[PDB]
């Protein structure tokens, strides 16, 4: 008996990316993550989008 | 739009020679002297047992025998390149603003990733030169089987 | 990398990016109905069994 994942995931686009993608037709995910990483100077992400 | 999902970095492993098993076979010592070492040596001296012969035969003197071993020198090294931009950046901040801040931490992570990709590289090398050394040392199967 | 001996040349540090990319695959089913499945799905024609 395996345990799986019962539902589809949910990716979503924050604000940012709305902008983004109405200005420059494109999307970075996790727009505010890396921006947060970038100023703070941390070079690793947690994760991935 | 089109989406970038992830950037990705390759997280390294590292290696140090004492935790390898093919360190069982290495005494590991150091030496701060070492440069101004000329090869060092070691002394034995053994004197055979004989046997008390019968009647009409000659007789074995007593011998000594006192041999001499001696050690190897075989150096390693490895270099790591930065660039001008990268030392002007570490060095030196032209303005406040966002970018230049960038600028500067990226000098900085440039420097270090060097640092630890040399340092990694060193216990390497010390693993490989060591087992080289054995390789070089050890005859074959049908040689020592034959002794 | 690995430290070098005498008279072996030294390996520089190599920094190597790739890039990957999706794909797209759309799927489409029909299914339809007749007009009569219709007309009889809204209207009761004087109620009868």
Same mark, same amino acid.
């Given at each position: ?26 999307? =970075? ?15 690793? =992400?947690?994760?991935?989008? | ?31 701060? @002297? ?10 034995? #001296? ?41 030392? *002007?950046?570490? +060095?030196?901040?032209?303005?406040? *603003? ?14 270090? +990733?060097?640092?630890?990709? *040399?340092? @990694?590289?060193?216990? +390497?090398?010390?693993? #490989?030169?060591?087992?080289? *050394?054995?390789? +070089? ?11």
């Amino acid at each position: 008996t395996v345990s799986a994942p019962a539902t589809y995931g949910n990716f979503v686009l924050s604000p940012e990316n709305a902008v983004t993608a109405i200005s420059y037709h494109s999307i =970075l995910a996790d727009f505010n993550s890396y921006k947060a990483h970038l100023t703070s100077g941390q070079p690793h =992400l947690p994760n991935d989008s | 739009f089109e989406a970038i999902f992830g950037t990705f970095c390759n997280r390294l492993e590292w290696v140090y020679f004492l935790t390898s098993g093919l360190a069982a076979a290495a005494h590991a010592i150091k030496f701060h @002297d070492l440069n101004k070492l000329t090869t060092g040596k070691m002394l034995f #001296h053994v004197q055979v047992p004989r046997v008390a012969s019968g009647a009409g035969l000659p007789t074995s003197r007593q011998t000594t025998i006192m041999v001499t071993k001696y050690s190897e020198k075989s150096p390693i090294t490895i270099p790591f390149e930065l660039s001008a931009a990268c030392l *002007t950046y570490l +060095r030196e901040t032209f303005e406040g *603003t966002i970018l230049d801040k960038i600028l500067n931490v990226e000098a900085m992570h440039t420097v270090l +990733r060097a640092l630890k990709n *040399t340092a @990694d590289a060193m216990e +390497r090398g010390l693993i #490989h030169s060591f087992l080289q *050394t054995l390789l +070089r040392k050890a005859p074959p199967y049908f040689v020592v089987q034959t002794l």
